[PDB]
Amino acid sequence: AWPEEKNYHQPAILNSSALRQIAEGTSISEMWQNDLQPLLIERYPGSPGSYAARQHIMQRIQRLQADWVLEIDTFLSQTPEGERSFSNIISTLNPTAKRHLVLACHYDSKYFSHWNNRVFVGATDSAVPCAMMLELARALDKKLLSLKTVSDSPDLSLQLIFFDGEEAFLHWSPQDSLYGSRHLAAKMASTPHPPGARGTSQLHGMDLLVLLDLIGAPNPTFPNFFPNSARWFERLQAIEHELHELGLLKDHSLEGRYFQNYSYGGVIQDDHIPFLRRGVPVLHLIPSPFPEVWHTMDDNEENLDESTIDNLNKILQVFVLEYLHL
Numbered sequence: 001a002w003p004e005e006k007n008y009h010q011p012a013i014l015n016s017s018a019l020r021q022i023a024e025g026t027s028i029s030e031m032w033q034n035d036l037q038p039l040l041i042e043r044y045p046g047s048p049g050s051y052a053a054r055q056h057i058m059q060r061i062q063r064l065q066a067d068w069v070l071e072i073d074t075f076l077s078q079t080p081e082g083e084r085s086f087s088n089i090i091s092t093l094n095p096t097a098k099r100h101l102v103l104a105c106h107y108d109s110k111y112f113s114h115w116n117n118r119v120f121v122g123a124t125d126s127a128v129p130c131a132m133m134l135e136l137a138r139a140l141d142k143k144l145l146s147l148k149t150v151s152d153s154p155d156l157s158l159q160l161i162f163f164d165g166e167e168a169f170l171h172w173s174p175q176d177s178l179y180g181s182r183h184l185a186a187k188m189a190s191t192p193h194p195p196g197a198r199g200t201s202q203l204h205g206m207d208l209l210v211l212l213d214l215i216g217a218p219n220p221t222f223p224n225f226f227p228n229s230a231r232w233f234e235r236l237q238a239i240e241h242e243l244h245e246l247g248l249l250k251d252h253s254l255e256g257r258y259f260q261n262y263s264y265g266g267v268i269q270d271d272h273i274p275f276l277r278r279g280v281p282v283l284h285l286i287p288s289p290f291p292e293v294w295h296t297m298d299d300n301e302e303n304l305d306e307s308t309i310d311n312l313n314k315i316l317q318v319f320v321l322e323y324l325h326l
């Protein structure tokens with residue numbers, strides 16, 4: 001019955017004092033310098049920047065006190081440019097815990113021919129989401145360190161996934177996209193969890209996939225995409241509203257809020273699709289419309305909005321703490 005626990009799981013909602021502590025515990029300037037800027041490089045699969053981004057993400061995680069278990073899921077696949085190597089980065093607390101909240105983004109950058117000595121670094125797409133996850137891991141390190149403490153009073157922990165190969169090499173298609181996520185979802189579907197279990201897979205273990213994509217532009221509007229995650233989307237709205245009321249957000253208005261009541265009219269393709277089609281609940285934190293700079297050379301550092309990202313860092317960290325009861 002444990003794969004059904006996610007359906008009844010409740011947050012442990014934090015009081016004003018705790019919310020102030022979280023808002024002050026995260027540093028947008030240290031994320032910018034130590035987590036974001038090293039990723040603002042060309043990093044399509046197999047590029048020098050692909051290897052550098054991987055090493056940077058792993059190094060930033062390994063320096064933390066929490067008991068993170070890093071795994072690199074490396075595989076070959078045919079592409080339009082030819083057989084390429086892809087490496088997903090998985091970072092897991094308590095790997096044998098039956099349940100994980102999963103935060104994820106893609107760390108590859110889309111390939112574009114250089115033009116006018118300009119290189120696409122995909123600042124929103126998705127270097128900022130990578131940096132946000134690393135900053136969450138740092139800001140919450142002491143609280144996450146307590147997950148190492150066995151105590152029988154749920155069997156639930158945190159996992160981070162940095163997908164490789166999200167972007168098409170040529171034109172987006174079922175066989176020219178989602179290289180890392182299609183591979184990892186298939187592998188997880190085939191892998192018993194907990195080890196030795198009968199019937200249940202690692203995908204049953206995924207309580208909720210929170211996929212960050214195209215974050216960093218000013219005035220993002222996130223639609224509530226899915227009914228089976230809508231109650232969790234509403235927690236993001238309530239956290240945003242409460243942090244704003246408490247004066248803990250910068251350059252933020254109620255009419256210019258991020259998390260929207262309405263849903264979306266189409267189906268966005270992204271790294272969550274291979275998980276969603278196999279029953280995993282998904283909270284797809286992608287804006288609609290996409291950033292103005294999307295898939296242009298102007299998706300760069302200069303066009304990021306620091307206050308927006310800082311605000312979203314605070315909202316995400318509260319959400320994660322409340323989900324995990326920390």
Ligand SMILES: Cc1nc(-c2cccs2)c(CCC(=O)N2CCC(C(N)=O)CC2)s1
Pocket residue numbers: 125166172213214266268269270
């Ligand atoms: C030419 C195309 N117009 C669209 C759409 C227009 C309006 C709604 S959808 C496509 C589908 C959307 C899509 O392919 N992705 C994949 C890459 C993701 C990412 N991290 O860049 C974003 C979503 S393709």
Ligand SMILES: [Zn+2]
Pocket residue numbers: 110125167295
């Ligand atoms: Zn993209």
